[PDB]
Write a protein that binds this ligand. Sequence first.
Ligand SMILES: CCOC(=O)c1cc(=O)[nH]c(=O)n1[C@@H]1O[C@H](COP(=O)(O)O)[C@@H](O)[C@H]1O
Ligand SMILES: CCOC(=O)c1cc(=O)[nH]c(=O)n1[C@@H]1O[C@H](COP(=O)(O)O)[C@@H](O)[C@H]1O
Lengths: 215, 215
Amino acid sequence: VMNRLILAMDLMNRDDALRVTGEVREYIDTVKIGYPLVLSEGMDIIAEFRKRFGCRIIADFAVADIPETNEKICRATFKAGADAIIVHGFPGADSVRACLNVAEEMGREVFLLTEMSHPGAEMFIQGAADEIARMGVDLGVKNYVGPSTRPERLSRLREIIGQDSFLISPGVGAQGGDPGETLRFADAIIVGRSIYLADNPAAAAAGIIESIKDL
Amino acid sequence: VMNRLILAMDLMNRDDALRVTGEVREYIDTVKIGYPLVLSEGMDIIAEFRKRFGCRIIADFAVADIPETNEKICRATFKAGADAIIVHGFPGADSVRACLNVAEEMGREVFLLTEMSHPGAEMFIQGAADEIARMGVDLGVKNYVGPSTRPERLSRLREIIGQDSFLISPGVGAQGGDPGETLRFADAIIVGRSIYLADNPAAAAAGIIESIKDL
Ligand SMILES: CCOC(=O)c1cc(=O)[nH]c(=O)n1[C@@H]1O[C@H](COP(=O)(O)O)[C@@H](O)[C@H]1O
Ligand SMILES: CCOC(=O)c1cc(=O)[nH]c(=O)n1[C@@H]1O[C@H](COP(=O)(O)O)[C@@H](O)[C@H]1O
């Protein structure tokens, strides 16, 4: 992805989300849109962004339901124009496979969320995360999400998935993660608040990128 | 809830969802709306149903993100008129607490999803589910979701949460669960396909209810 930087656009107002995304578009080719924006402004926001900005859109829907419901969510999401969808692995292999099947049908991609970045991830997800990643490998998943806040975990994830899999990583900036350290293991970093709450989002993005280029 | 039966309205077309819900409304007072319908028709569908049918709406959004994102999802969902939201416990206590805080702010309810009903739930969720339920109890959660497909698990869940907590249970009918057995432990059952794919949804609902009344 451009500059190895993915914007997490979690503003909840269309006007603010369009302003910030336009201001930083010279520095990214990929925007992650989640439920904060979609549930406030509608699924049509995905195609609007995709067209306006000529970006890739990752729908961060943390998909975490039974196979039949996951199927439906994925189909609605790809019908709305998303390039990829983020799926939890904790519901197990049939739930993941359901999403992979729809992505295969519709020519899209699944990202498997393996271990989360926030403190509560230590309670239950972290102990399962290596197995969740191995399950991904055995299902043929090629794209993964793991935590900037724990680069030792992010290194173990990378070890499981191999060098050819694509790994993106949230938790940079606001949550405490570091761009450069995270990019030792991840292919791209996700950044939300450190850019979209900045007084100058373009300057915030540019500053991050200047630290990425130095790598 | 009326007749201890909650409709899972996972049709993806507004006209079909309104037809079926209207046909079975004499038999329920509570509809569960999830992402299949909301991502196809918009969040406005919640208030439309709530008003048209004078039902309670549970937003089944399987909320499974970091605390700050969960906050945003909950606020958008309650702003849309939902009475309650379903939240995963697997992301840990801070993610759950974030949802509880918004519900307290907005006079709404959280349901904690503890153990899922599909086969893949055995991989990772089932081994954590008793702890997830105990975490719920220690956070003050009063409403829970557990699986009709495993009534021995559903009994253990009930044992943890006590007799005063409210427990609802999906997996009845299509997934193999039985109404009467499930209602030995759950206060209400969730039913989707066995009603909404039936040639006569009202007759399907009535048949289920006639088996519930016999209990
Ligand atoms: C939960 C599914 O989505 C994610 O991508 C995600 C997983 C995770 O472990 N950590 C994480 O922060 N994210 C998401 O990535 C974004 C992080 O934004 P920020 O902390 O503001 O830089 C935000 O949308 C959050 O919901
Ligand atoms: C995943 C969050 O939501 C749920 O309520 C849920 C959890 C679970 O373990 N099992 C389960 O079936 N559900 C939901 O409950 C509904 C079951 O519908 P059905 O099987 O058609 O009777 C459906 O919306 C499904 O997504």
